Symmetry: D2
C-alpha cells in the first residue's frame, strides 16, 4: 500500500444522476463565505475534484458535493458542488442527495415528521425539508431560486436538415433552452440518445454566438449551458418526458431540478393550470421529480415564481478514496 491522500465520500444517487458527498479528508476550507470557500477549492484543490469526477474513479456523467463547515451562524453545515466540468453554483439532484445523507447518517438530528435543513452552497442558502417516516427518509422538497420565462419563440440555424422551427429560453437558477423533439429525429430512450447528446451539446456552442442575456440583476452566467429536449411521457404518473445536456458533454439521468425549477414558467401566464398545482416531471431513466409553483413573485421586469421541487436520494455505498503518488492517472483522466 501507499497513498499520500485519503478522502472519505458517501455515494448517493437521486432518480439516477449519482452524487459523491465528500464528508471527511479535508477538515477546513478557509473562505469566509461558501463562495470564496469554493474559490479556495478552485485552485489549491480542483484535483480532489478531478480525481473523484474523472476516470478511473468517476465517469463522464458523474457528479458530487463537499460537506464543509458553515461559518454562517443559522445552523447545519456548508456544501460546495462539483462535476467533470468544474464547480456548479446550485445542483438540485444533489441538494436532495446532501440533505438525505445528512439526516440518514448522524450529521444532523432527524425530527421524525419532516426535518428542515438549510445548507450554505456558494449560491444562496438552500432550503430542503426531508419527509422521514419514523425510521428513514422517504423524499425531500427543495425550495428553488425565483425562476422565470425569457423571450418566447426564438431559433438559430440548426444543421441537418429541416433548417427550421422555433424553440424557447427560461431561467431556473441557471438559463436553459427548450426543444419539442419534432425539431427532428429524437426518441429519448436508453436504446440510442447518442444523436441527442451530440445534436444537443452542439447548440450550447452554436448559441453563445448571440442572443446573449445576463439575468437582469447580479452578473455571473452571461450565456449558455443547460439545454433541454421534451415531448410526451412513458410513465403514466407524469406528463411530458425530457432530459438536459450540460457540463463538458454529459446528460442528466435525473429529470434535472434546475431544469424543472425552470419551464414551470409556462405552467402559469402561458396557460396550463395556474398555481399551487401538481407537476410530475420524468427524465430518460424513466424516474420523476414533483414540481409546484408556491408563491409567484411577479418582479418589475418579466413574471417569476419561487418553486418547490421534490426528489429522493438513496445511499449507494461508503467510499475511502486514496490517490497513488505513482499511478500516472492519480488525478482526473478523461474522454
Amino acid at each position: 500500500m501507499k497513498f499520500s491522500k485519503g478522502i472519505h465520500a458517501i455515494d448517493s444517487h437521486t432518480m439516477g444522476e449519482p452524487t459523491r458527498i465528500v464528508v471527511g479528508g479535508i477538515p477546513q476550507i478557509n473562505g469566509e463565505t461558501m463562495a470564496d470557500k469554493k474559490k479556495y477549492l478552485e485552485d489549491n484543490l480542483d484535483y480532489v475534484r478531478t480525481a473523484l469526477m474523472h476516470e478511473p474513479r468517476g465517469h463522464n456523467d458523474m457528479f458530487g458535493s463537499i460537506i464543509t463547515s458553515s461559518n454562517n451562524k443559522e445552523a447545519d453545515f456548508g456544501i460546495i458542488f462539483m462535476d467533470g466540468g468544474g464547480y456548479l453554483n446550485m445542483c438540485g439532484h444533489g441538494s436532495i442527495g446532501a440533505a438525505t445523507v445528512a439526516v440518514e447518517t448522524g450529521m444532523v438530528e432527524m425530527v421524525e415528521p419532516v426535518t428542515n435543513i438549510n445548507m450554505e452552497a456558494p449560491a444562496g442558502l438552500i432550503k430542503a425539508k426531508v419527509m422521514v417516516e419514523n425510521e428513514k427518509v422517504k423524499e425531500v422538497s427543495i425550495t428553488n431560486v425565483p425562476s422565470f420565462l425569457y423571450m418566447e419563440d426564438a431559433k438559430l440555424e440548426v444543421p441537418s436538415l429541416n433548417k427550421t422551427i422555433t424553440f424557447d429560453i427560461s431561467f431556473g437558477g441557471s438559463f436553459f433552452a427548450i426543444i419539442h423533439a419534432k425539431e427532428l429525429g429524437v426518441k429519448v430512450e436508453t436504446s440510442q440518445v447518442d444523436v441527442l447528446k451530440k445534436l444537443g451539446i452542439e447548440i450550447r456552442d452554436l448559441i453563445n454566438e448571440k442572443i446573449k442575456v445576463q439575468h437582469p440583476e447580479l452578473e455571473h452566467i452571461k450565456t449558455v449551458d443547460l439545454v433541454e429536449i421534451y415531448d410526451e411521457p412513458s410513465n403514466p404518473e407524469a406528463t411530458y418526458k425530457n432530459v438536459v445536456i450540460f457540463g463538458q458533454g454529459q446528460v442528466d439521468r435525473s429529470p434535472c431540478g434546475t431544469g424543472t425549477s425552470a419551464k414551470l414558467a409556462t405552467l402559469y401566464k402561458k396557460g396550463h393550470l395556474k398555481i399551487d398545482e401538481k407537476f410530475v416531471y420524468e427524465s430518460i431513466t424513466g424516474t420523476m421529480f414533483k414540481g409546484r409553483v408556491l408563491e409567484e413573485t411577479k418582479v418589475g421586469e418579466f413574471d417569476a415564481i419561487i418553486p418547490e421541487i421534490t426528489g429522493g436520494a438513496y445511499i449507494t455505498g461508503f467510499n475511502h478514496f486514496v490517490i497513488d503518488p505513482e499511478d500516472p492517472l492519480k488525478y482526473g483522466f478523461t474522454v
Copy 2:
C-alpha cells in the same frame, strides 16, 4: 440508514480500464471448480454484478472481479471476472489488478524481488509474476493462453461508403477482428471516437451472420465479440495505436491484454522480427502494455505462441457498497 446487503470492494485501475475487486461480503461460493462457482454466481447472484457494474454505482465501460476461495490445492485464491455485459472467462487488465491488490494488501505474502501468484478464474489457472521494488508493486507480467492467427484477409459489407478493403481475425484467449483505420474516417482520440464505438460495435453484429469458427478443440465461444481498430502510435515508446470494442457496447481504456495476447500472432510467421522481442502496445488513453512471444507452440493446425503481457494496476480507493431495499435502482440501471 438501512441496507440489507453490504459488499466490500477494492477499486483498482490498470492503464485506465477500472477493476472493482470484491474481497468480502459473500464468504463462500459453492461450486467445486471456479467454472461452476461462476455458474453459481450467474443465477443466484448476478445482481451484486448488476448493482456494481451498472449505474448509479458503476458505468458503461466499468469492470471488476470477485476474489473467492480456491478449492484447487496449488495455493492462493479463486477469482471470477464480471462486467456490464455478464461474466468474462479471462480479463487481463484484471488478472493484473487482482494480482497487484493481492500483494499490495496482505491477501498474499509479498516475496520482495517478484511474487509469483497463480489465481484460478473460471478459465484455466492463470500465471502472474509481480515485480515489487522493496516497498511496492511496480508492474505484473501475466502469461496468457496459447494464442494464434485465424485466416488472413477476409472482409464483409461495411456500410457508408467505401464498401471496400480487407480486415483479419485471430485468437488471444478470445477471438478478435483487426482494422487498419484507413477502412474510413477514424482518428482514435479522446476528442471523438463516438463514430468509432458505433461503427465498431455494428461489425460485432454484422459478422455473426457467417464466417463462424469455433477454436479447433474445446467448444464455448462459436463467434464474435472483441473487435479492434489500429494505426501508428502517438507515444514514441510504443509502435501502432489501437483500441477494442466489446461487452454490451463499451471501449477498453487499456490496450486490452486478450487483445495484445492476440495479433502478436503476425509478429512471427507474417514477418516482423520473430521471437522473444519487445512489443510495447498502447490504447486510446495513451498508456501502454508490453507484449512478448515466449515459447512459440506450433500445434498441428495453424501456428500458435504462449505470450507474456506486462501491465500495472494502482488502487483507486476502498469501497463499502450497500443496497437500499427501497432504492428503485437498488440493482443495475443502464443506458
Copy 3:
C-alpha cells in the same frame, strides 16, 4: 501512508463481550477441517490475531473470529474463534455474533420467520436459527456441541488462600471448572473483577498439568481453558449468574454460551431443572442468555444433554485495519 497488509472486519457485541469478525481480509485459508484451518491459523498468522486482539487495536478481554470457506457440505460458511490468549474451539456469544452479521449484512439471504445458518466451529458443525422480525434480527438461538459433566466433585490446591476442597468440571463445546463463589470467597461484582481474573487463571493453570482432562472424540482437546465462577442472581428475571476467566487472563462480559451449555449439562445429571425448562444465565455486566436442555444424546463414555442457548448481537461499526510496517507495535502489544 504505506501499510503492507489491510484486514476488513465488522465490530459486533453480544450482551457486552465484543466480537471482531474478519470478513474477506484474506481470501482463502487451506486446512481441510475447521480444526486444521485453526492450526493453519495459530502456526501461521496468529499475529493477525495479536494485531487485532492486543492493544492498541483490541484490549485485554476483547474477542473475535474469521468468516472463511466451508469445505464441509451443508454449512453456509467456515468460522474460526480467537481471543487475546489464543484460539477457542467454540464461542456462544461469537456464534450469535457471526450469525447475526451473516444475516444483517446480507452475506446470506434472510428467511423472514427464522433464518437457519450452519457454521463450522471447529468444535463441531453448529446450527444457529436467527429470529428476524420482517425488517431486522430479534435474537439468535445457537444449538451447541453435545455437552456433559466430567469427573464429578474433583480436588484442588492451596495457593492464596488456605486449602479448601470440592468444586466440579464439565464440557460445553470447550472444557470448564464451575465454582459456587463459596470455595474461593468472592462475589461476582465489577468491584472485584481483578481478583477473579487473577485467581481464575491461577486455577486454570494449577488444575492443569495434574487432572485427566480429555473429550472421547476430537483427540486435539485435553485442555480446560475456561474457569467458571457462579452464585445466585441479582436480577430476579435470571437464575444463578457466572463469569468465565480464560485466554491470558480475561473475563467474559457475556454469560458465556459455551459456559452455560456446560453448567446446565452438569445440572439434569445433577437433578435440578429436567429438560425443555427455562434457564436465564446472567454475567457480571448484567446481561442475560436463555439456555434450555434438548435431545439428551450420549458420548463414548457418559450420557450428555446437547443444549441450546439464545442471545442477541448488534453491529458496532465497520473496521478497515491496516498495519504500518514501521510501527513498533504493528502486531500485538500485550501489557
Copy 4:
C-alpha cells in the same frame, strides 16, 4: 441493517495509548473558541464520546479526539480531546496523533523537511512540527502551553494507608500532582497497574474539593484531573519514568506529553537540567517521549518554561462506526 448515525474515525496509537480521531463524521460544530466548541460537545453529544470510548467499541483507558473547523486564524484545523472519563484541555500523545494523521492522510500537504501544523487545543493554540523523511513521517515535536510549578510541596490525607506528608502539584496544559513512588510505596510495573489506577483517582478526588487549584488565565480550569507517579528509570536510554491516572480511573500507556511538560516545568524551577537539555521520559509500557525546556516566559503570578515534547504516532486502521438504535449498549457501556 438500519443505523441512525455513522461516525468516520482513524485509529492511531502514540507510544501505546490509542487515539480515535473522528474525521468528518459530523460536518460543523459551532462554539466560537475551541473551549466552547468543547462545551458544545460535553453538554450536547458526549455520547458520541461514550459510544466511542466505553465498551464494546472502546475500553477503560482508550483515548481519542475530533478534527473540526478552526474559526481561529493561522490554525490549519480545530481538534478537541476526549477520553472514557470526559474531556481533557490538551493531550501530547493526542496532538502527536492528530498531526501525524493530518500529514499522513494528506489532510494537509507535507513539506518534506519538517511540516508545521497549528491546531486549536483548546488549552491554547499548539504548534506541532512533523519530521517527514522524503516518503513518510519520522516523529512529531509538539511545543506545549506555557507550563509551570504550582504551590510547592503541599499536603495530603490518610485513607489507605497511614498519613504520610509531602509531594508537589504543577500545570502542563492540564494540572497535575507528582509523587516519587516513595510517598505511597508502589513501583511502576504492569504487576501493580490496578493499585496505581485505584489509589491514583482516590488522590485525584481527595486533593480536590480542598486545594486552591486555578490557572491565572483560561478561567474555566480550577481542576487537577491527572495524578502523576514517577521513579528512576529501567531503560538506561531514559531518565525518571512515570504513569498518569485520570478520567474515571484509566492509566496512560504513553509517558503523557502534558504530564512531562508539567514535570520538567517543576524542574528548572527545582534546579536540575537547566534549559535546552535532553529529557527522555518513559511510561509503564516501556515507551519514551523526548522533552526539552525552551523560551522560559512567565504567567500572571509566576515564571513558567514553555516546553517541547517529541513522540511518534502510527495509524492502526480506519473505522466506520455505526450505532444500532435497537442495541441496548448503542452508547457507552462502562463496567
